[PDB]
């Protein structure tokens, strides 16, 4: 890879520069290079990896939705035939999004997940695995859609089992995992009652554990608890 000649520390240093410059494709490429050095990632380095690819795939998903909406309207009754261009370009963006997802899943499979023994690292990577299979599922329409959905579900479920046994209910990673697994239930698995039940139980069990936390930890946990509340308000 193009980053094979650059020191691991320099890749991490430049990933942070890219974030400051809002150059998230660069940031993701630097962090991919860092992962491919073969050493495990620190807490800070894991969050650099997730931030970079979250932003890249976030822009692709927003673009795919714009184009998908245009495509759907073009297939309504009374809509003028405009040729293959809308579908072609939606497919282009879709293929690039799928490529980003495959890249992340490849990093997790080779070999981040298998070397992650601590709960904080293992849960973090399994959440990521669930997230990027979810993003594949958002655009899936074929014969592998059900297996893609189950791959997201299975990764989320293993992460949930570990986090409930090994982390306190206010842990930001545990909270963000539960937030996203709830979103999976609502937006992917057609299970809104499961999504609502999970978000409520997660919020309540975190509320009851806030008294154990410092001011700084309290701020982190309540920030993510508010996202659970936002979704419950949106959904009810």
């Amino acid at each position: 890879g193009a980053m094979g000649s650059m020191e691991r520390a320099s890749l991490i240093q430049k990933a942070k520069l890219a974030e400051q410059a809002e150059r998230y494709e660069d940031m993701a490429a630097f962090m991919k290079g860092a992962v491919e050095k073969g050493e495990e990632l620190s807490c800070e380095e894991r969050n650099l990896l997730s931030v970079a690819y979250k932003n890249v795939v976030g822009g692709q998903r927003a673009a795919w939705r714009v184009l998908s909406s245009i495509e759907q309207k073009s297939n309504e009754e009374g809509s003028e035939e405009k040729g293959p261009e809308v579908r072609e370009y939606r497919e282009k963006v879709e293929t690039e999004l799928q490529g980003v997802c495959d890249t992340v899943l490849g990093l997790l499979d080779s070999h981040l997940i298998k070397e992650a023994g601590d709960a904080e690292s293992r849960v973090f990577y399994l959440k990521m695995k669930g997230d990027y299979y979810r993003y594949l599922a958002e655009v899936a329409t074929g014969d592998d859609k059900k297996r893609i959905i189950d791959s997201a579900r299975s990764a989320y479920q293993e992460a949930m089992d570990i986090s409930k046994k090994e982390m306190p209910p206010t842990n930001p990673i545990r909270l963000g995992l539960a937030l996203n697994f709830s979103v999976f239930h609502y937006e992917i698995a057609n299970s809104p009652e499961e999504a609502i039940s999970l978000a409520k139980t997660t919020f309540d069990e975190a509320m009851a554990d806030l008294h154990t936390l410092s001011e700084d930890s309290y701020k982190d946990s309540t920030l993510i608890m508010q996202l659970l509340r936002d979704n419950l308000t949106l959904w009810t």
């Binding site: 997230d131 909270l175 963000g176 995992l177 937030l179 996203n180 709830s182 979103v183 609502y186 937006e187 993510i224 996202l227 936002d230 979704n231 949106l234 959904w235």
Partner: peptide, 7 residues
């Protein structure tokens, strides 16, 4: 119906 928040 809108997109939900995620982490």
């Amino acid at each position: 119906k809108d997109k939900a928040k995620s982490c």
